[PDB]
């Protein structure tokens, strides 16, 4: 049982390295026949803050790359939204910018968000200026994180969980 359950939405195309952000989450454990054949699109973990037990449940929602119109599936029903672009890929940044502009338009101010610039591999070429992404992030008033180093990803989740807890 938990004091809180915080729902996180992980938004990102294929090939931007979303797996990288999910290493401190685990799959739930099933006997259910139908689930055991296919799996699920969310992962879980438990943390403790201020004496309170909090489940974090993160959805990397199956099929999301196919439906990129911004609907209430993207802007409602999550405590936190994590949007991931690939630093080696200008069109990736351009798409996420757009998605986040639209999410900003329709979401509650009460939803925590995070822009993540990921770079999966040591050896591809960087092309997205972090000043520009940071300038964009500041404009919507949301944190920005550049990731490769697993450490700062954990800090980001922890800060987001802390901020969600203050508003709930």
């Amino acid at each position: 049982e938990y004091d809180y359950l915080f729902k996180l939405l992980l938004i990102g195309d294929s090939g931007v390295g979303k797996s990288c952000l999910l290493l401190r989450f685990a799959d739930d454990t099933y006997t259910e026949s139908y689930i055991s054949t296919i799996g699920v699109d969310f992962k879980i973990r438990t943390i403790e803050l201020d004496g309170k037990t909090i489940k974090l449940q993160i959805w990397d929602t199956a099929g999301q790359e196919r439906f990129r119109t911004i609907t209430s599936s993207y802007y409602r029903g999550a405590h936190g939204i994590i949007v991931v672009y690939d630093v080696t890929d200008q069109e990736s940044y351009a798409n996420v910018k757009q998605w986040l502009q639209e999410i900003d338009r329709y979401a509650s101010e009460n939803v925590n968000k995070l822009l993540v610039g990921n770079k999966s591999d040591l050896t591809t070429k960087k092309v997205v200026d972090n000043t520009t992404a940071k300038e964009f992030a500041d404009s919507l008033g949301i944190p920005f994180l550049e990731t490769s180093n697993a450490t700062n990803v954990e800090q980001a989740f922890m800060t987001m969980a802390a901020e969600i807890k203050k508003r709930m």
Binding site: D28, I35, I38, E65, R66, S73, A78
Partner: protein, 193 residues
């Protein structure tokens, strides 16, 4: 049998699913997508194995609209179903449906190819939700439970709830969300069968 034969059978299965999609048959699409998934798991075939065989197949704008309708409803339902009462079985089941539908799409499409849905063929959210639940009721283990209730039985209970909202003209995202998030906490007896 050979890999070439198994691929041809998988192709036929994918086409069956695509035919149901075109007919707007929600139950029949979901069953066919499941039969595709089963057969490809049995035969150790993955989406990238089938994809080059489907090169001249197409998912229609109507098809995409149905897939979109399913996606939105499942996305929303998996999240709403995650509560402090329970957050494992009902989100799991709903998420597993959604993945099965992504699987069908992944057999045809390369990574990041966007759907091109025709809004004319959008299915109402409350009808999609009943379809998903009916499929869950079919594939759930007989002894499966969501919290203290039999899964099949809660699926029937939520179905009735959505149908009653329809009848009193009180379907909206908030009323739907309130059924989707319920675990029957206020029921005097636990649901069986």
């Amino acid at each position: 049998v050979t890999r070439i034969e198994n691929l041809e059978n998988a192709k036929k299965l994918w086409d069956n699913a695509n035919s149901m999609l075109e007919k707007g048959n929600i139950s029949g699409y979901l069953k066919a997508a499941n039969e595709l998934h089963k057969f490809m798991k049995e035969k150790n075939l993955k989406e990238d194995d089938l994809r080059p065989e489907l090169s001249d197949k197409t998912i229609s704008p109507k098809g995409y609209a149905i897939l979109q309708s399913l996606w939105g409803a499942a996305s929303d339902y998996s999240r709403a179903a995650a509560t402090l009462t329970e957050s494992t079985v009902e989100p799991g089941l709903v998420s597993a449906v959604n993945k099965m539908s992504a699987f069908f799409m992944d057999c045809k499409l390369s990574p990041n190819e966007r759907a091109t849905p025709d809004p004319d063929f959008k299915v109402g959210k409350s009808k999609i939700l009943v379809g998903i639940m009916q499929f869950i009721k079919d594939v759930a283990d007989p002894t499966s439970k969501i919290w203290m209730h039999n899964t099949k039985a809660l699926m029937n209970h939520k179905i009735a709830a959505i149908q009653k909202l329809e009848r009193s003209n009180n379907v909206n995202d908030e009323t739907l969300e309130s059924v989707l998030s319920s675990k029957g906490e206020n029921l005097s007896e636990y649901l069986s069968y």
